[PDB]
Amino acid sequence: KNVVIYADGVYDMLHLGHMKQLEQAKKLFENTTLIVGVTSDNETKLFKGQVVQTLEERTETLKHIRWVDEIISPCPWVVTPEFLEKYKIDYVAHDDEDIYAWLKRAGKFKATQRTEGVSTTDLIVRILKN
Amino acid sequence: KNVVIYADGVYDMLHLGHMKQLEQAKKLFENTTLIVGVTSDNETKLFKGQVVQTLEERTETLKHIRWVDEIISPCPWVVTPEFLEKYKIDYVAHDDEDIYAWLKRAGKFKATQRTEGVSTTDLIVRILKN
User: Fold this and answer.
1) CA–CA distance from A11 to each of A1, B66, B121 (Å)?
2) Which of A64, A123, A125, A128 to mutate to test the interface with B (most CBs of B within 10 A)?
3) Cα–Cα distances in Å, from B96 out to A84, B31, B89, B100?
4) Cis omega before residue A81 (within 30°)?
5) Where are the beta strands (DSSP E) in chain B?
6) Which of B16, B123, B124 sits opposite A60 (nearest CB)?
């Protein structure tokens, strides 16, 4: 009955938006194991953009999050069909050409949603006003 | 065998330092309930200083933290002997005239430690360097 969910991300400067998305992934089924993948510094910078926190710093915050059962750190930048078999992953949970088309084709994709404005970036934007 | 621990604080822009301190409070005994108190905006500003996040925002992040079992939000600014009886609190866990002298006199004080440099403040100080 237990369903293995895989949620990968950069998880830089973790905020409420990330936490609610992890909650959503954890609660996709009644009984789950939520594995979180944390992207490497090099690949994040190479493919996405600057990261504030190191891999070690981003990974350590995640172990304090209620919803997180297991962590793969660093994780592969691109999910492969082989990765799913290796870790017995039933669904990939991530926000939504389409690099997820093959997961949806297989019935293994579970969309999760981000929250805007809750970001550590925005909180410093809110300050300074004084 | 279950021990009720009370850890109050502002918990503004929660970072790894706060999370490790909550972990420490949760793990003071083999079996605990960790109650976290979240200070009101007014009293925090009046007695300590500016707060970035609202009470609602500081409280909501805490419900995502593995170690947190219960939340009192808002909490009283000053712990009283009556508060301990009301909530059946066995120990107050907080970093260390001495407003905690009466708790230590009663055997009800458990010191916990903060971590420096892990603060959201310092992370923006680390950036900008680019």
Assistant:
1) 29, 17, 18
2) A64
3) 48, 23, 18, 8
4) no
5) 3-9, 32-39, 70-75, 91-94, 109-111
6) B16
d(CA A41, CA A65): 21
Residues from chain A that touch B36, judged by Cβ atoms under 8 A, are none
What are the b/e assignments for B55-67, b being 16+ CB within 10 Å?
Answer: bebbbbbbebbeb
Q: How far apart are CA A117 and CA A15, in angstroms?
A: 10
Q: Which residues of A are less than 8 Å from B70 in CB distance?
A: none
Amino acid letter, B39: T
Q: Are B64 and A60 within 8 A, CB to CB?
A: no
Instruction: Specify the amino acid at residue A117.
Output: G
In the block, which residue shows the tokens 């301990």?
Answer: B84
Q: Which residue has the tokens 């007695």?
A: B47
Beta strands A32-39; B109-111: pairing state: unpaired
Structural tokens at position A125: 């934007």
Give B-chain residues touching A19 at CB under 8 angstroms.
Answer: 61, 64
User: Coil, strand, or helix at residue A86?
Assistant: helix
The pair of three-digit structure tokens given for residue B113, joined into one six-digit string: 């430690």
SS3 B54: coil
Deposited experimental method: X-ray
CA distances from A62 to A2, A83, A108, B111 (A): 22, 21, 24, 25
Q: Are B61 and A16 in contact (CB under 8 A)?
A: yes
Q: Which residue has the tokens 């979240």?
A: B38
Domains and CATH numbers, chain A: 3-126 (3.40.50.620)
CB contact under 8 A, B61 and A13: no
